[PDB]
Write a protein that binds this DNA or RNA. Sequence first.
DNA 1: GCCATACGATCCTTCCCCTAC
DNA 2: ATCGTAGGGGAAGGATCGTATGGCCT
Lengths: 1085, 267
Amino acid sequence: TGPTQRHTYYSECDEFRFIAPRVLDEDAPPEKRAGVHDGHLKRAPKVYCGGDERDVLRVGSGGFWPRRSRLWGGVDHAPAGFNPTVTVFHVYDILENVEHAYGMRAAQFHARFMDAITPTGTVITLLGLTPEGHRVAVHVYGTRQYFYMNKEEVDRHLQCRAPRDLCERMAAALRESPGASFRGISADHFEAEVVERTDVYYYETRPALFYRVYVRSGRVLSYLCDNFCPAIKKYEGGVDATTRFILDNPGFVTFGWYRLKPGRNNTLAQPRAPMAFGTSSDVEFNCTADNLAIEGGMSDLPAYKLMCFDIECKAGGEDELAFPVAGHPEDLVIQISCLLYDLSTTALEHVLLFSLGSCDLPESHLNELAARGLPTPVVLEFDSEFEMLLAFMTLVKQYGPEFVTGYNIINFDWPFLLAKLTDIYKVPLDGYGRMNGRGVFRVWDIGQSHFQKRSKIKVNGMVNIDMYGIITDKIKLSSYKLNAVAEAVLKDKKKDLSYRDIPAYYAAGPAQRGVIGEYCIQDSLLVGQLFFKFLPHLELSAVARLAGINITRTIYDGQQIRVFTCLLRLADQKGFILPDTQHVGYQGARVLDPTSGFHVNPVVVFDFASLYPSIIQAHNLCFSTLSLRADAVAHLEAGKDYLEIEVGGRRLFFVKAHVRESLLSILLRDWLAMRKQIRSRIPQSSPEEAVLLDKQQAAIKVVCNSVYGFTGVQHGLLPCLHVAATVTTIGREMLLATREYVHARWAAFEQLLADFPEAADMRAPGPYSMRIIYGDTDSIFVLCRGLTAAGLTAVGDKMASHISRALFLPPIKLECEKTFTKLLLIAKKKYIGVIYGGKMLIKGVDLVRKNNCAFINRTSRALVDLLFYDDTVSGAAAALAERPAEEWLARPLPEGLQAFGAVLVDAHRRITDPERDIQDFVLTAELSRHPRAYTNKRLAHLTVYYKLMARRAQVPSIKDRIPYVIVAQTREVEETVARLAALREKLLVSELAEDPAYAIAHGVALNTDYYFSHLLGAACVTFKALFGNNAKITESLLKRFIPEVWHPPDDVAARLRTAGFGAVGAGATAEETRRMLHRAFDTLA
Amino acid sequence: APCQVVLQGAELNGILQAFAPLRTSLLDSLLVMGDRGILIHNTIFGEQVFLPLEHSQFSRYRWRGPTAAFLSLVDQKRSLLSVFRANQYPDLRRVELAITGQAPFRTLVQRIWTTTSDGEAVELASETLMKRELTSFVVLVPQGTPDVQLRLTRPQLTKVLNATGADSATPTTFELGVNGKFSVFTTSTCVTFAAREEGNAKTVYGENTHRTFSVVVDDCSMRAVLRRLQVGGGTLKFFLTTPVPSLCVTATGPNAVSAVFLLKPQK
DNA sequence: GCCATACGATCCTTCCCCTAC
DNA sequence: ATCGTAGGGGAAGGATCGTATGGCCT
Ligand SMILES: Nc1nc2c(ncn2COCCOP(=O)(O)OP(=O)(O)OP(=O)(O)O)c(=O)[nH]1
Ligand SMILES: [Ca+2]
Ligand SMILES: [Ca+2]
Ligand SMILES: [Ca+2]
């Protein structure tokens, strides 16, 4: 008949651009060997596999890669009589597009599906899988966006009654728009009605009448909200049609199972004719919102497909050691590795290796793969790069991986492939997703614009999950390279291949290409192992289902959208409407004064559980429940019915729950259930799985606490700083009240014993001195000297319960978290301690920071373990506190501090020997902004960035960490610095950093003085609490330990020796030197 | 203390008198001690500054181990020799040096007394200093025959020091005389002395008759350092016998200081 | 005694990195 | 386009100050 929707993706090709290296044809003499072939070739693209030549666009019978697509270029490649039945299907993604009756007049759609979109319409497309395994795309009609406007304002400014006249005026305004695109729009496209609504802001607002406007398009609503009378307040003008469809029908979810049911008037979903298919699914349906129901029975994922992919490039122009550039035609993608998994059993299904040229994999790799039962790899050889890229795109379109993954694909792989496909070969990739055309296929980066903070990729019906982002926020490592993380979490030491030896391997022969392919397949296998070890899709799907947005928006949008979408449900349910509005803002928490020092007595820790959510729930803080002025709440009993607070010099009133319940209270109540469920499985059975449930519950805690951030965002969407400031003030008041209550109750001599008889057993010699020594927001450290640490856990729990019962109303609960045995307080948010069980906790100091090298960290860890574990040094450190630091500047140190000097001298000896490992002296600094957005421009890592850019190396992105090493200051180094400063326009500035690879290649000596000084500084700043928090005295005492007091002549010894100068000391250890002294003195005296 | 050293007021007066012109330089210097006394070594402007202190200059000097070297500064900007300068502490009573420990771990502890308004006890306890052994050290001291000597007086420095001080471009051409004088014709000043070496301001009253030293200096700098040490005058000792000739200017008086410089080794 | 000055430490701001809440 | 605020600590820069003496007193 004829396809109603044109298939933009390639299906028949005859002409293509031929670009390939010249070292592949027959290995020609050096004359015609360098360079890259270029020109226009007129033939059908083809693929080679095992000596078999096939056409890439030759769907049917024989094939090399697996295919899951039914149609191909208007041809039904399905068996005759294929009419599968669909009753239950799991939907994973939701689409949205625009359709017109004129375009769809060729199809055989029902009247009910044509009258609802006759001028224009929006159709919600749900993509999923049937239990059998058939891809299904169901279309839902009858959904229109709507927004609220003030009836009084439009009646006063425009003076137009008869709401149809409002639609006529809107259509007239659209018709006279400067752009010649709103043609044919009339009043029939708009539907204006009168509704009774109440504004969410403030408690004194009275319900009023609003014009609810339904618009039957997507860009029309945006244009009306943007240009049409911007002086009138608008409500919910930014909510998309997908959210409207989700929230209008109760119980609907964006990720889960759905069931097709008969409609209102016994109407059924219409299967779509195969010729009129708009997607690449096997079967499609047409229905409305009345035909769909939620099935609570099935709760397992269907047989989805995952594609872990990776690409490799090789510079083909001059200076082959330079990094490849996508814009350069000579640079090519030599190889692509693609591993296809099934997301129902976590089992390997297919392995593919696209290679440009012949590639014979080594037999060792094949034997290793066969030993583990993995499938035998399939290698496809291509004559040009365009053929390989077209084959990869065809595989993506045909197999249709529902989930796609890799490592650093958002920043390197996908942009490179897209640039090569679009800027060079001019290929339309709009229809290469799941839609047959006019889809979304794009990548956004951070760049200079501060609007975005994350790099995103949007593909319709394709969930891209880069593992770099997942690894970045699950483990803490100085370097996030593939080898480092592989050795860290997988404990698998894997070989690596840089980009400086790839050209030699490629020009050598097919065996080297096979070696490269082996390395790339190992890379893809490692990425898949990480993906299936962490399983991000389950967590992201759960968050998307709970929030009410797509999984893609859950991954890429942020945290404000989830809270806004989840609050919109309650806003619509309660009759409220959310208005549209689009330096430090307010005061935060309080940190107490730390009594820094080395405490040997037990230290217990008390902390509130879910501080901010509990405060919001208990005190009824919300947008609707707030009055900024008096006489508007002056009809209720004071105190009992409302709470008056003093925030920022202003009095605020929050009425109690029994009068007007908070909207945010139900938000937090719903969001905390997931965390409670997650934390209930950790202590059941988890030898090593609990490390992932901890991350999951931490993420849920972050998204729960994000409600306060959302309500405290300045210049955001739906902001109100009053609630956030009230929460902070309440938290500070609770902290101070807890401190005062603990000080004034159990601290005299016996009150703790009277309250708890169990204190009779645990009583060390000495009087009670129960006091608070440190506080942070809601954490309180209590130094319980004179009591044994074995009886301060149950007692601590009882005390926490008593305090929570006697001071704060529910759901605010304070619990005894930890119990230190030896504490070392340094400053605010910086302390190292030992738990009663035996574990050691480090917070704040450079040991747990990512900008310190391995040598200093190892030495500091050794010193900390020495101090906290050996009895002699601990006793000596305790005795150090008796005298002030000044006395220690002229008195010998206690005999205990002897192993400290041993560690110091060992570190000094190890740092001053030939052939030092450069990897132990590398530091890392994170680039967070664009280089042009730096005021200082002197940071010792922007220098490395510019040096890497100058030599055409791998320029780091705007969110990864640059490593560097501080080289020694030599005359050559100084001359190079001067030349660089002169061209790019005394003691040298500390911007001596250099790329570690460059230092390894050129063999540059490292600045030992800088590293030793930094080691001493870290050691003194960590242990300055032992000497009364004085940096100078501690530094002098630490430097006293070192034996680096060698005093040799500055290359003038030879001249004096030639003048007849006696030698004293040094190698002459015998007695004549004494006579030499006489021999000197008789010359002088 | 196996090597305790006690310096009382009787020798403290002499030490203070010796250090009175030495208001600088020796603050940043090395101190080598053995069984005979203390030698202070410094490298002022590439010039070897040496201060000897014999055992007879201390009341209770004592040593038991081998030679040792100590750096005056302790924890930076705190010199062990700060007691012997001008009138920093106008109540100096006694000086104690406490060497304790093993041969490679010997430590010097300095404690200072004070003549208060009604006492002469320790009192001062926060000014005690501790300095550990320098471990590996090599010290080169000028030794050899003094060759020809001479008793240069205070007024002579107005013409033997402030003559050229301008490197080899304007050198002093260190000589004595082709006929038996001590006239050092530098470039134009032509300072003239009569030598008259025994054993009149023209006569220099020399000793150890050589009267052949005529080798030019390596580079004429001098001046400042001798000005810096505030030396009134002293004896010039020559070391041309060695392959590298040297010149040593040693002051006159108790515990004199010596400035040592290297001449032209061409001969 | 003098007075002059070029050295030097010595704070004191401001900006940028990661951490603890 | 899209969570918030307190804290320490290293590094590069500008202004401040306590002395060390000499030129000059003489
Ligand atoms: N806006 C915002 N606020 C945060 C954030 N983190 C902490 N807070 C403030 O809560 C202080 C207590 O933090 P916890 O880590 O104890 O958390 P908790 O809720 O008290 O839970 P536990 O006490 O059980 O750890 C955050 O990421 N964003
Ligand atoms: Ca790669
Ligand atoms: Ca990679
Ligand atoms: Ca808490």
